[PDB]
Specification:
mainly beta; 13-stranded mixed β-sheet; two-stranded parallel sheet; binds 2-mercaptophenol; binds zinc ion; lyase; Human carbonic anhydrase II
Length: 258
């Protein structure tokens, strides 16, 4: 059966195998900009990616992941709402079949064409597997993509997608610099939440950047030619791999800017 994003195994079904789906701190959420609270106690983010070592890009059947060496403090995130050092391990995207949908978080109900998740784990826990069992285990930088002008720093990724078209294909992907994917400002919203895919673990401190990056229609078109299926299986295009917004419940969205 295996979870996915179709009519018979999509988000509305996940709770049957993953009861945390109906949890207290699920993601994504809509960010109501008038109800978010400015917090002057919040620090600026510290992104230190100059020593990043990318290894591989992989189609895992529900997105593509770019993987990094996380055996040392090469690429890390500090500051913001975080205590401690968080190591970059991978990034992926979620995107839509149309330009008007694709992001997971929304801002005053507005949807963007895609959302970038840069995933980091708290080095006090020793490895990624242990971190995801902890309420402060991961920090995920969420960046919105809107369609407009091309993003130079995304094109090396776009170029290699045809070689990982189906589930289980991987390719070498060294010397990729993720700084090419950041917006110019690092102002953010932050709230405690979860993975937006199974197993939906409630271990994430979300950090959602205010400023979107722009990408060209031609760049996102190439995302939409990937396949959910494996080679030799009937073709299903990899589109709309996003989960709808979940109820905020007892949580406060905090803003770093006023
Ligand atoms: O947010 C971390 C790891 C894997 C997937 C998502 C986050 S969707
Ligand atoms: Zn994600």
């Amino acid at each position: 059966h295996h979870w996915g994003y179709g009519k018979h195994n999509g988000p509305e079904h996940w709770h049957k195998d993953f009861p945390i789906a109906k949890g207290e701190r699920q993601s994504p959420v809509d960010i109501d900009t008038h109800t978010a609270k400015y917090d002057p106690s919040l620090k600026p983010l510290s992104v230190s990616y100059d020593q990043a070592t990318s290894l591989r890009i992989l189609n895992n059947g529900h997105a593509f992941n770019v993987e990094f060496d996380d055996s040392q403090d090469k690429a890390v995130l500090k500051g913001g709402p975080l205590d401690g050092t968080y190591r970059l391990i991978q990034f992926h995207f979620h995107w839509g079949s149309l330009d008007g949908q694709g992001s997971e978080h929304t801002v005053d109900k507005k949807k963007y064409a895609a959302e970038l998740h840069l995933v980091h784990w708290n080095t006090k826990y020793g490895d990624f597997g242990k971190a995801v069992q902890q309420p402060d285990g991961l920090a995920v930088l969420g960046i919105f993509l809107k369609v407009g002008s091309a993003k130079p720093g995304l094109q090396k990724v776009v170029d290699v997608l045809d070689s990982i078209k189906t589930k289980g294909k991987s390719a070498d992907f060294t010397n990729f610099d993720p700084r090419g994917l950041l917006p110019e400002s690092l102002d953010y919203w932050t709230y405690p939440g979860s993975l937006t895919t199974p197993p939906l673990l409630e271990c994430v401190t979300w950090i959602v950047l205010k400023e979107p990056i722009s990408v060209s229609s031609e760049q996102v078109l190439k995302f939409r030619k990937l396949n959910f299926n494996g080679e030799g299986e009937p073709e299903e295009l990899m589109v709309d791999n996003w989960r709808p917004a979940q109820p905020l419940k007892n949580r406060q969205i905090k803003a770093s800017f006023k």
